[PDB]
A paper describes a structure:
The C-terminus of the severe acute respiratory syndrome coronavirus 2 (SARS-CoV-2) protein E contains a PBM (PDZ-binding motif) targeting PDZ (PSD-95/Dlg/ZO-1) domains, which is identical to the PBM of SARS-CoV. Targeting multiple cellular PDZ (PSD-95/Dlg/ZO-1)-containing proteins through short linear PDZ-binding motifs (PBMs) is a common strategy used by viruses to facilitate their viral replication and dissemination to new hosts. PBMs are mainly located at the C-terminus of target proteins and interact directly with PDZ domains. We solved three crystal structures of complexes between human LNX2, MLLT4, and MPP5 PDZs and SARS-CoV-2 E PBM highlighting its binding preferences for several cellular targets.
LNX2 acts as a molecular scaffold for Numb family proteins, essential players in the regulation of cell adhesion and polarity. Each of the two LNX2-PDZs present in the asymmetric unit are bound to the peptide. Electron density was observed for the last five residues of the two peptides. In both cases, the last three residues of the SARS-CoV-2-E-PBM peptide bind to the canonical α2 helix/β2 strand groove in each PDZ unit. As for MLLT4 and MPP5, the PBM of protein E conventionally binds to the PDZ of LNX2. The proton amide of Val 0 also forms an H-bond with the carbonyl of Ile 353. In addition, the amide and carbonyl groups of Leu -2 form hydrogen bonds with the carbonyl and amide proton of Leu 355, respectively. In one of the two complexes, an ionic bond is formed between the carboxylate of Val at position -3 of the PBM and the amine group of Arg 357 at the end of the β2 strand.
Author numbering:
A (entry chain C): 118 to 122
B (entry chain A): 334 to 423
The structure:
């Protein structure tokens, strides 16, 4: 739902 | 989204992270940059900023996307990651 890419 | 532009980041290695924290807002559709990771790829470029909307990554439509889809497009991409951003006004 909330990633570090 | 008062300004639309492209920013292309260049991964120094195949598995390099862009250093972008992608989050979704509960009040509107889209994928948004919450913050840039200190010293990361995107932060060193400096073109990107918090509150930017990621409209597309490498031509892949992220208008109604999710941060997980964005991560999968970046994982599938080569060294050039071409982000299309919609920066709000003031």
């Amino acid at each position: 739902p909330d990633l570090l890419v | 989204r008062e300004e639309i532009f492209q920013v292309a980041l260049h991964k120094r290695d195949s598995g390099e992270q862009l250093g972008i924290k992608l989050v979704r807002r509960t009040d509107e559709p889209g994928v948004f940059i919450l913050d840039l990771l200190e010293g990361g790829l995107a932060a060193q470029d400096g073109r990107l900023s918090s509150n930017d909307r990621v409209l597309a990554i490498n031509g892949h439509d992220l208008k109604y996307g999710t941060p997980e889809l964005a991560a999968q497009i970046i994982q599938a991409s080569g060294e050039r990651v071409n982000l299309t951003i919609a920066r709000p006004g003031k």
